[PDB]
C-alpha cells in the first residue's frame, strides 16, 4: 500500500531560539 | 617508498598531523584554557560566553 502525508516531517533545523518570525 | 637512511633530505620520511577544527551546530565543546570569572549585570560590560 501507499499513503499520503499531509504536513509531516518538519524538524527544527538547529539550535538557536526564535519567536514569531516566518523564517526561510 | 623504499626509505633508506642514506637518503638526501627531501627523500627522508616526514610524519604529518593535520588538525581540523570544525564547528557544526552543537552547544559547545573543547577549547583553550580560560580562567573564567564572575558574572556582572545591568552594567555595560564586555563579555565572552
From Swiss-Prot, chain B:
Location of region: Disordered: 25-47
Variant or mutagenesis effect after changing residue 11 to H: In strain: Omicron/BA.1, Omicron/BA.2, Omicron/BA.2.12.1, Omicron/BA.2.75, Omicron/BA.4, Omicron/BA.5, Omicron/BQ.1.1, Omicron/XBB.1.5, Omicron/EG.5.1
Effect of residue 2 to S: In strain: Omicron/BA.1
Effect of residue 25 to P: Increased resistance to human covalescent sera neutralization
Superkingdom, natural source: Viruses
Known function: Attaches the virion to the cell membrane by interacting with host receptor, initiating the infection. The major receptor is host ACE2. When S2/S2' has been cleaved, binding to the receptor triggers direct fusion at the cell membrane. When S2/S2' has not been cleaved, binding to the receptor results in internalization of the virus by endocytosis using host TFRC and GRM2 and leading to fusion of the virion membrane with the host endosomal membrane. Alternatively, may use NRP1/NRP2 and integrin as entry receptors.
Subunit structure, interactors included: Binds to host ACE2. RBD also interacts with the N-linked glycan on 'Asn-90' of ACE2. Cleavage of S generates a polybasic C-terminal sequence on S1 that binds to host Neuropilin-1 (NRP1) and Neuropilin-2 (NRP2) receptors. Interacts with host integrin alpha-5/beta-1 (ITGA5:ITGB1) and with ACE2 in complex with integrin alpha-5/beta-1 (ITGA5:ITGB1). May interact via cytoplasmic c-terminus with M protein. May interact (via N-terminus) with host bilirubin and biliverdin, thereby preventing antibody binding to the SARS-CoV-2 spike NTD via an allosteric mechanism.
Name used for this protein in its record: Spike protein S1
Source organism (scientific name): Severe acute respiratory syndrome coronavirus 2
Residue span relative to the full protein: 495 to 543 of 1273
Amino acid at each position: 500500500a501507499y499513503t499520503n502525508s499531509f504536513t509531516r516531517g518538519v524538524y527544527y533545523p538547529d539550535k538557536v531560539f526564535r519567536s514569531s518570525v516566518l523564517h526561510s | 617508498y623504499g626509505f633508506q637512511p642514506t637518503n638526501g633530505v627531501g627523500y627522508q620520511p616526514y610524519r604529518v598531523v593535520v588538525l581540523s577544527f570544525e564547528l557544526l551546530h552543537a552547544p559547545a565543546t573543547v577549547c583553550g584554557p580560560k580562567k573564567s570569572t564572575n558574572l556582572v549585570k545591568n552594567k555595560c560590560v564586555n563579555f565572552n560566553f
